[PDB]
Design a protein around this motif. Structure first.
Motif, PDB file in Angstrom:
ATOM      1  N   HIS A 194     -15.058  49.544 -22.076  1.00 36.81           N
ATOM      2  CA  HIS A 194     -14.083  50.009 -23.051  1.00 36.81           C
ATOM      3  C   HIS A 194     -12.646  49.574 -22.723  1.00 36.81           C
ATOM      4  O   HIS A 194     -11.740  49.704 -23.547  1.00 36.81           O
ATOM      5  CB  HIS A 194     -14.172  51.533 -23.199  1.00 36.81           C
ATOM      6  CG  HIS A 194     -13.711  52.293 -21.996  1.00 36.81           C
ATOM      7  ND1 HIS A 194     -14.403  52.297 -20.804  1.00 36.81           N
ATOM      8  CD2 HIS A 194     -12.610  53.054 -21.793  1.00 36.81           C
ATOM      9  CE1 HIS A 194     -13.746  53.026 -19.920  1.00 36.81           C
ATOM     10  NE2 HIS A 194     -12.653  53.495 -20.495  1.00 36.81           N
ATOM     11  N   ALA A 227     -21.266  46.506 -28.501  1.00 38.54           N
ATOM     12  CA  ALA A 227     -21.908  47.714 -27.989  1.00 38.54           C
ATOM     13  C   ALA A 227     -22.393  48.584 -29.160  1.00 38.54           C
ATOM     14  O   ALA A 227     -21.780  48.606 -30.231  1.00 38.54           O
ATOM     15  CB  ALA A 227     -20.930  48.486 -27.115  1.00 38.54           C
ATOM     16  N   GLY A 228     -23.503  49.287 -28.966  1.00 38.76           N
ATOM     17  CA  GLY A 228     -24.024  50.126 -30.029  1.00 38.76           C
ATOM     18  C   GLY A 228     -23.125  51.313 -30.333  1.00 38.76           C
ATOM     19  O   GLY A 228     -22.226  51.639 -29.552  1.00 38.76           O
ATOM     20  N   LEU A 278     -23.478  54.432 -30.085  1.00 44.21           N
ATOM     21  CA  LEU A 278     -23.418  55.399 -29.002  1.00 44.21           C
ATOM     22  C   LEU A 278     -24.469  54.954 -28.001  1.00 44.21           C
ATOM     23  O   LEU A 278     -25.647  54.855 -28.340  1.00 44.21           O
ATOM     24  CB  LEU A 278     -23.746  56.796 -29.526  1.00 44.21           C
ATOM     25  CG  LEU A 278     -23.567  57.965 -28.556  1.00 44.21           C
ATOM     26  CD1 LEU A 278     -22.076  58.177 -28.278  1.00 44.21           C
ATOM     27  CD2 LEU A 278     -24.177  59.221 -29.151  1.00 44.21           C
ATOM     28  N   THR A 279     -24.037  54.665 -26.781  1.00 41.98           N
ATOM     29  CA  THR A 279     -24.940  54.200 -25.731  1.00 41.98           C
ATOM     30  C   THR A 279     -24.437  54.720 -24.394  1.00 41.98           C
ATOM     31  O   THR A 279     -23.345  55.283 -24.314  1.00 41.98           O
ATOM     32  CB  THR A 279     -24.963  52.664 -25.645  1.00 41.98           C
ATOM     33  OG1 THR A 279     -23.703  52.208 -25.152  1.00 41.98           O
ATOM     34  CG2 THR A 279     -25.205  52.043 -27.015  1.00 41.98           C
ATOM     35  N   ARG A 280     -25.231  54.533 -23.344  1.00 41.64           N
ATOM     36  CA  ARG A 280     -24.836  54.988 -22.017  1.00 41.64           C
ATOM     37  C   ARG A 280     -24.112  53.882 -21.270  1.00 41.64           C
ATOM     38  O   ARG A 280     -24.411  52.706 -21.444  1.00 41.64           O
ATOM     39  CB  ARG A 280     -26.052  55.431 -21.209  1.00 41.64           C
ATOM     40  CG  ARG A 280     -26.786  56.635 -21.776  1.00 41.64           C
ATOM     41  CD  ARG A 280     -27.720  57.223 -20.726  1.00 41.64           C
ATOM     42  NE  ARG A 280     -28.687  58.161 -21.292  1.00 41.64           N
ATOM     43  CZ  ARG A 280     -29.614  57.831 -22.189  1.00 41.64           C
ATOM     44  NH1 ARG A 280     -29.709  56.579 -22.631  1.00 41.64           N
ATOM     45  NH2 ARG A 280     -30.450  58.754 -22.649  1.00 41.64           N
ATOM     46  N   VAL A 281     -23.144  54.267 -20.448  1.00 40.72           N
ATOM     47  CA  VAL A 281     -22.381  53.304 -19.672  1.00 40.72           C
ATOM     48  C   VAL A 281     -22.138  53.852 -18.271  1.00 40.72           C
ATOM     49  O   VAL A 281     -22.161  55.069 -18.059  1.00 40.72           O
ATOM     50  CB  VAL A 281     -21.012  52.982 -20.340  1.00 40.72           C
ATOM     51  CG1 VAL A 281     -21.235  52.282 -21.671  1.00 40.72           C
ATOM     52  CG2 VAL A 281     -20.203  54.263 -20.524  1.00 40.72           C
ATOM     53  N   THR A 318     -21.428  58.221 -14.827  1.00 41.86           N
ATOM     54  CA  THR A 318     -21.911  57.641 -16.074  1.00 41.86           C
ATOM     55  C   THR A 318     -21.629  58.578 -17.244  1.00 41.86           C
ATOM     56  O   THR A 318     -21.736  59.801 -17.119  1.00 41.86           O
ATOM     57  CB  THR A 318     -23.431  57.350 -15.999  1.00 41.86           C
ATOM     58  OG1 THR A 318     -24.115  58.503 -15.487  1.00 41.86           O
ATOM     59  CG2 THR A 318     -23.705  56.148 -15.096  1.00 41.86           C
ATOM     60  N   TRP A 321     -21.370  58.696 -21.940  1.00 37.97           N
ATOM     61  CA  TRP A 321     -21.758  58.098 -23.175  1.00 37.97           C
ATOM     62  C   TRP A 321     -20.546  57.391 -23.704  1.00 37.97           C
ATOM     63  O   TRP A 321     -19.422  57.792 -23.393  1.00 37.97           O
ATOM     64  CB  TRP A 321     -22.228  59.128 -24.214  1.00 37.97           C
ATOM     65  CG  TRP A 321     -23.499  59.821 -23.896  1.00 37.97           C
ATOM     66  CD1 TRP A 321     -23.652  60.995 -23.208  1.00 37.97           C
ATOM     67  CD2 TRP A 321     -24.820  59.372 -24.228  1.00 37.97           C
ATOM     68  NE1 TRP A 321     -24.989  61.303 -23.092  1.00 37.97           N
ATOM     69  CE2 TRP A 321     -25.727  60.325 -23.705  1.00 37.97           C
ATOM     70  CE3 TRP A 321     -25.323  58.260 -24.915  1.00 37.97           C
ATOM     71  CZ2 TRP A 321     -27.115  60.195 -23.849  1.00 37.97           C
ATOM     72  CZ3 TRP A 321     -26.705  58.130 -25.059  1.00 37.97           C
ATOM     73  CH2 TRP A 321     -27.583  59.096 -24.524  1.00 37.97           C
ATOM     74  N   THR A 365     -18.540  53.997 -30.117  1.00 37.47           N
ATOM     75  CA  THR A 365     -17.807  52.874 -30.681  1.00 37.47           C
ATOM     76  C   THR A 365     -17.793  52.875 -32.204  1.00 37.47           C
ATOM     77  O   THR A 365     -17.025  52.127 -32.807  1.00 37.47           O
ATOM     78  CB  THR A 365     -18.402  51.525 -30.270  1.00 37.47           C
ATOM     79  OG1 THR A 365     -19.679  51.390 -30.890  1.00 37.47           O
ATOM     80  CG2 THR A 365     -18.520  51.411 -28.746  1.00 37.47           C
ATOM     81  N   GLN A 388     -29.105  59.830 -30.341  1.00 38.39           N
ATOM     82  CA  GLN A 388     -29.172  60.045 -28.900  1.00 38.39           C
ATOM     83  C   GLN A 388     -29.317  61.523 -28.573  1.00 38.39           C
ATOM     84  O   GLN A 388     -28.925  62.391 -29.359  1.00 38.39           O
ATOM     85  CB  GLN A 388     -27.912  59.506 -28.224  1.00 38.39           C
ATOM     86  CG  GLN A 388     -27.616  58.067 -28.565  1.00 38.39           C
ATOM     87  CD  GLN A 388     -28.770  57.158 -28.220  1.00 38.39           C
ATOM     88  OE1 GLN A 388     -29.213  57.109 -27.069  1.00 38.39           O
ATOM     89  NE2 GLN A 388     -29.269  56.433 -29.216  1.00 38.39           N
TER      90      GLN A 388
END
Ligand code: HEM
Length: 388
Positions: free
Chosen positions: A6, A21-22, A24-27, A31, A33, A36, A290
């Motif tokens: 980000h 990036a999707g 809502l995804t994990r990063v 860690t 969420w 975007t 999610q």
């Protein structure tokens, strides 16, 4: 690239991998969420019932630390609270940001802007617009808002930032903090005796003693830290963006509405904040497909959200004349930027006065490299040589 996704930009845009990036995804070294999608970001930020703001958070935490905030749990910090508590604090500080108050600031902002432009003009073309304007106007504007005497502004800036500058010795930071609070307390006392038009006077005039010194001190610092980098970043990138689309500069050579629309668009297009305060799910829930569990952290990518392809088929272009797009650069929900009107007024004034004074403004060197500011909570430039 070790730097968080980000945080990545490509030129004036979000990095391609960030844009890819999707929703809502994990990063990932905690860690969280990452949101975007415009709709998802709005859902997370607007629902304070299910996503509380992560108390005590620093918009830096990386490689640097040079000249960044230091919470220490500061009372009166709107960001560290949620309704109904947040609503109480917000309502208490609101008297200083009413639109009527902002209208009255217009004349002062113009004076400040022209004074910095005078110094740049005196230096002669070409000159660094960042050193003369972008890095100076924001802090002066904030001092004017708060009620700081013109002759104390430089000192006040040093004391405010200094008492929170980690890179300093403890002996120094403590000396600066002593003087700072002392100065702040004396200013607060004067405002309670005879309220002025400034932020503090407005608050004490309306709520008197209900607004404690601690709260007022908290408000001052929070405001001083929230309205500086964002603006310097916008002035620098904003001028660069306009010079890259010179035909769009006409939006600053006309009525006020036209300048206002340009500013809004520039704010959307450039979205200087990488993300708002992290949001924590107060319970388990299902968002964008999610499975979010209580205690999960959510980082909202405002720049990516403001480039959501659902918003427009040319959302990736700068178009000051486009049908306005409800962006999330100022946030969304109860925490929406308290200084948004001031930011828009301030930025409209800078651009309007700038091109009125230097009609033929341009990059000193068309092929000069761009010096992006990568060490601050807000994107910007460290230098920008221009000629006129
Ligand atoms: C273009 C410049 C600016 C941008 C893009 C910006 C953006 C933001 C964002 C995204 C938030 C919400 C954060 C969150 O929800 O976690 C926020 C909050 C805030 N901003 Fe700004 N801001 C700007 C200028 C300013 C200025 C000039 C001031 C002060 C005069 C300021 C004062 C605040 C305050 C106090 C809050 C907290 C409000 C609350 O928590 O209820 N900002 N800003």
């Amino acid at each position: 690239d070790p730097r968080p996704l980000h945080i990545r930009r490509q030129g004036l845009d979000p990095a391609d991998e960030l844009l890819a990036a999707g929703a809502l995804t994990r990063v990932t070294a905690e860690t969280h969420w990452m949101a975007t999608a415009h709709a998802v970001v709005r859902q997370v930020m607007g629902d304070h019932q299910q996503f509380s703001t992560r108390r005590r958070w620093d918009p830096r935490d990386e490689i640097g630390g040079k000249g960044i905030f230091r919470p220490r749990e500061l009372v009166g910090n709107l960001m560290d609270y949620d309704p109904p508590e947040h609503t109480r604090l917000r309502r208490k500080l609101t008297p200083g940001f009413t639109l009527r108050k902002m209208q009255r600031m217009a004349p002062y902002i113009e004076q400040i802007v022209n004074d910095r432009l005078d110094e740049m003009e005196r230096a002669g073309s070409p000159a660094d617009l960042i050193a003369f304007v972008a890095d100076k106007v924001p802090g002066a504007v904030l001092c004017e808002l708060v009620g700081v005497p013109r002759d104390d502004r430089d000192m006040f800036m040093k004391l405010c930032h200094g008492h929170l500058d980690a890179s300093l010795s403890q002996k120094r930071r403590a000396a600066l903090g002593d003087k700072f609070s002392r100065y702040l307390l004396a200013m607060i006392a004067r405002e309670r005796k005879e309220p002025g038009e400034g932020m503090i006077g407005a608050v004490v005039a309306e709520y008197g003693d209900d607004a404690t010194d601690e709260e007022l001190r908290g408000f001052c610092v929070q405001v001083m830290l929230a309205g500086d980098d964002n603006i310097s970043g916008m002035i620098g990138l904003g001028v660069l963006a306009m010079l890259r689309h010179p035909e769009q500069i006409d939006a600053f050579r006309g009525d006020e509405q036209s300048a206002q629309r340009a500013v809004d668009e520039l704010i959307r297009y450039l979205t200087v904040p990488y993300s708002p305060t992290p949001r924590i799910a107060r319970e388990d829930l299902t968002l964008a497909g999610q499975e979010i569990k209580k205690g999960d952290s959510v980082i909202c990518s405002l720049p990516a959200a403001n480039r959501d392809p659902a918003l427009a088929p040319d959302v990736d272009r700068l178009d000051v004349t486009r049908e306005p797009i409800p962006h999330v650069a100022f946030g969304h929900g109860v925490h929406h930027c308290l200084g948004a009107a001031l930011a828009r007024l301030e930025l409209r004034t800078v651009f309007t006065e700038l091109w009125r004074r230097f009609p033929a403004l341009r990059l000193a060197d068309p092929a000069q490299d761009t010096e992006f500011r990568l060490t601050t909570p807000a994107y910007g430039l460290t230098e920008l040589m221009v000629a006129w």
